[PDB]
Amino acid sequence: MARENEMDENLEQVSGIIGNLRHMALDMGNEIDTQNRQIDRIMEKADSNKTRIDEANQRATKML
Amino acid sequence: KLGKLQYSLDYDFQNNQLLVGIIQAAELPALDMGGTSDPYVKVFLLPDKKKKFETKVHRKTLNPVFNEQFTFKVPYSELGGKTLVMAVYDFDRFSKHDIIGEFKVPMNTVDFGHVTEEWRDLQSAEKEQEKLGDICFSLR
Ligand SMILES: [Mg+2]
Fold first, then answer.
1. Which of A9, B21, B100, B103 is the most exposed place for a label (fewest CB within 10 A)?
2. Pair B12, B76: CB distance under 8 Å
C-alpha cells in the first residue's frame, strides 16, 4: 500500500498545483484581454495622430 | 491640470441597467494643508440630476483609489440620449466641499458591446447671465 499511497500524495500535490495553474490561467487571460482593448485604443489614437501629422505636414509644406 | 480619472463603463442587457465603475484618479492638485487633498467622486446620470451617487471619502491622497461600482436602472432605448457626469470633489469638514473637477460622457459616443474602461483628463466645472430674456421694440 506504500506504493499506492506514495502515488496518492503525488496526485494530491498535482491537484493543488493544477488549481493554482487554473487561477494563474484566469488572471493571465483576463489581463491579456484588457491589454488587447488597450492596444486597440493605442492604434485608434496612433491612426488619428498619423492623419493629423500628414495633413499638418501637407499644410506646412503648402506655405513654402 | 488637476489630474486624470480612470473609469469603467458598460451596459448589462440581461437586467437592463447601466454599470458605471469608478476605478481611480491621478495627479490631483492639492487644496488642503498637509500637501494632499481629501477627494471623493460624485457620479450621476447627466440627463436628469436624480439619485446622484457618491463614493467614500479618501483621506489625504492625490491619487485616490475607489474601485467602486454604481448601477443605473435605465432602459436601453432611453440610454442613448442620456449623459454621464463624474465630478471630483474635495472634502472639507468646516466649509463647503469645493469641486476639484468634472467630466461628461455622451451616451451616443459610447459604444457598448465590449467592456469600456479609460483614462480621461479632468476639466474645470462651469460656473452665464441669469435672466436670458429679450425685449423687442421699434424707435422712430
Ligand atoms: Mg479637507
1. A9
2. no
State the smallest CA–CA distance between residue B114 and chain A in angstroms.
9
Resolution (A): 10.4
User: Measured between beta carbons, which residues in chain A are less than 8 angstroms from residue B117?
Assistant: 34, 37
d(CA B129, CA B134): 12
- Is A2-64 a domain of CATH 1.20.5.110? yes
Method: cryo-EM
In CATH terms, is domain B1-127 a member of 2.60.200.20?
A: no
Binding residues of B for Ca(2+): 31-32, 38, 90-92, 95-96, 98
- Dihedral of the CA atoms A52, A56, A57, A61 (nearest 10)? 160
